[PDB]
Every structure is written in C-alpha cells, then in structure tokens.
C-alpha cells in the first residue's frame, strides 16, 4: 500500500509545499497512500538537482514531483527520458515535446 514518490522543492517555496501536504490529506484513500520523500534544495544549481534526482532513483521511487529553473530544466527532462521516470511539475512548460514530463 506504500507507493514511494520523490519530492523536490525549492527552499524559498513554502506555500507551494503547504499545498502539497493538503493534497496528501484531501486525496488520501483507504486503498493505498503515497509516501513522499522530500529533499529541499536550491533549484538553480543543476548539480544539486542531479544529486537529488539520483537520490530518489536509488531509493526506488515510482514518480517524482518537483520544480526546475532555466539552469536545470534540461537536466530533469533528459534524465527522465532515459530512465523512463515520470516527473510532474508546476513550472513552465518545456520548449518542445519532452517525454516523461
């Protein structure tokens, strides 16, 4: 019943994380429940994003919810296209058709 998911949140994004916790309560059913793994990081540093994305991939997550900056967006899209990891994000749409986004 435990579904492991990855969570990447910027350090200056509090309300954006508060709404995530509310969604976990409002949509928590009795059949199963999601188990988020949060790692607060600097979204602009693409090394921190690369290091944090692989931290979720090693822990065997089934999906990742995060953000990206201009200095990282291509890091997320290319890693998710190769490892076929699904990535959900409320940031700006990708400049083109990128799968697993």
């Amino acid at each position: 019943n435990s579904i492991q998911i990855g969570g990447l949140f910027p350090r200056g994004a509090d309300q954006e994380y508060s709404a995530f916790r509310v969604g976990m309560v409002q949509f928590s059913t009795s059949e199963f429940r999601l188990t988020p793994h949060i790692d607060n990081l600097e979204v602009a540093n693409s090394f921190a994003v690369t290091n944090a994305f692989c931290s979720q991939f090693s822990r065997g997550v089934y999906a990742i919810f995060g953000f990206y900056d201009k200095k990282s967006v291509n890091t997320i899209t290319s890693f998710c296209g190769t490892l076929h990891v699904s990535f959900i994000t409320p940031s700006f749409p990708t400049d083109g058709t990128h799968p697993f986004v």
Binding site: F47, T50, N51
Partner: protein, 101 residues
C-alpha cells in the same frame, strides 16, 4: 602544415582554412600546457590523494588543489590562432581582437 596533413588520419584537415571552433580547440591545448607548466614552475603540487570516488558524493567533497588549477588557467597569457589570449577572473576572453571583414 595543416593543408599538408593526410586527410585519412585527421579528417577535415587538408584544406587551407580552419574553422573558428577548430582553431580555438588548438589554442585551448596551449592554455592547458602553459597552465600545468606554470604550476610546476611556481613550485606547488597538484597530485591526487587517492580515488576521487563518485561525483554524487554526499556531502559534496571538492578537492582543494582544484582552485590552484583554476588560478593557473586564468593567468595564462599566450598567443595563438585567435590572437592575444588572456582571461579574467571568470573565464571570459579579454584583450582579444575580432577582425571585421
């Protein structure tokens, strides 16, 4: 010497013109050689302690002698195919000359 090299060995090299991307590559090697040469001249060692390990090391461990290699590279001032070559503290070309034709 360029237009004399055998095209079977070095592809795209027996012509009398060289790309600006290719020429900067040749001038790049001169900067690298003069950097390590000045490190041997200024009497300091850059040899590694052991295995660098995994890049995703947590916490991120940056080697100390890497900042000496950066200081040597940006202080290189030689003459190459791109004219006068010298760098600032960031790594951008300065005192350079762009011919207008």
């Amino acid at each position: 010497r360029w237009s004399t090299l055998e095209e079977k060995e070095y592809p795209g090299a027996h012509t009398a013109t060289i790309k600006y991307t290719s020429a900067l590559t040749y001038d790049a090697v001169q900067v690298m050689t003069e950097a390590f040469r000045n490190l041997r001249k200024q009497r300091i060692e850059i040899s590694r302690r052991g295995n660098a390990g995994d890049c995703l090391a947590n916490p991120a461990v940056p080697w100390g002698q890497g900042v000496e290699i950066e200081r040597a590279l940006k202080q290189v001032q030689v003459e190459g195919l791109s004219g006068n070559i010298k760098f600032d503290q960031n790594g951008k070309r300065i005192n350079y000359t762009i011919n207008i034709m």
